Amino acid sequence: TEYKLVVVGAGGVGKSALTIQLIQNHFVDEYDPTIEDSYRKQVVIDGETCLLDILDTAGQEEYSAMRDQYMRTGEGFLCVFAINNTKSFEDIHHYREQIKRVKDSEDVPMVLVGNKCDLPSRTVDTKQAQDLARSYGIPFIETSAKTRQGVDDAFYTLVREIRKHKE
Ligand SMILES: Nc1nc2c(ncn2[C@@H]2O[C@H](COP(=O)(O)OP(=O)(O)O)[C@@H](O)[C@H]2O)c(=O)[nH]1
Ligand SMILES: [Mg+2]
């Protein structure tokens, strides 16, 4: 089965770098922040094959209805912030609200991702992010697209969350 995964978060948090590690096994140092693209990858998770369709978002669309549409078709959401950027963490509150609002749903599969854990000047404590995820009933995973810490776990965990919702 094909699953639609959507990677959301503020500009610069590492959405593209996380996605390209999973898809292409390398860490990109410069990927235009304004490009939005999708990637397909066949995988096996918990013994069951599936086709991932991963949308690496980049923010505003020509029409806001198009952003609403990809949230409606999206089955699970990787909500990414950067651990050195408090505003990107605060934005998670808005992503949670907006995705639920567009889907008109109280139960939306999501994983909270705190990326850039290899960088200095952390401003978001592990506990603060874990507590937020727990308040939503979703997993929290610390990642680094540079070292590949957590990357594969984040995406595979999101598929598990999608299946738990559908099952
Ligand atoms: N050190 C480090 N750099 C990262 C990490 N993730 C992304 N970057 C870099 O941070 C910048 C923004 O990443 P990008 O994936 O383009 O962010 P996006 O705007 O969310 O798609 C780029 O220079 C990436 O190489 C990370 O986990 N660690
Ligand atoms: Mg990007």
Residue numbers in the entry: 2 to 168
Please give the exact wording used by the authors of the publication that reports this structure:
Toward this end, we expressed and purified N-terminal processed KRAS (lacking the iMet with N-acetylation at the nascent N-terminus) using an insect cell expression system. Mass-spectrometric analysis confirmed the cleavage of the iMet and N-acetylation of T2. We attempted crystallization of N-acetylated KRAS (2–169) in both GDP and GMPPNP bound states; however, we could only obtain crystals in the GDP-bound state which diffracted to a resolution of 1.00 Ang. The structure of N-acetylated KRAS-GDP contains Mg2+ and resembles the Mg2+-bound KRAS (1–169)-GDP structure. In the structure we see clear electron density for the N-acetylated threonine and the Mg2+ present in the nucleotide binding pocket. The acetyl group interacts with residues Q43 and T50, in the β2 and β3 strands, via water mediated hydrogen bonds, which stabilizes the N-terminus in a similar fashion as the iMet in case of Mg2+-bound KRAS (1–169)-GDP structure. The 1.0 Ang structure of GDP-bound N-acetylated KRAS (2–169) provides atomic details of the interactions formed by N-acetyl group with the central β-sheet. Structural data presented here show that the N-acetyl group and the iMet play a similar role in stabilizing the N-termini and the central β-sheet of their respective proteins, N-terminally processed KRAS (2–169) and unprocessed KRAS (1–169). These results suggest the importance of N-acetylation in KRAS and possibly in other RAS isoforms, where its role is to stabilize the N-terminal end after cleavage of the iMet which in turn prevents any conformational changes around the Mg2+ binding site.
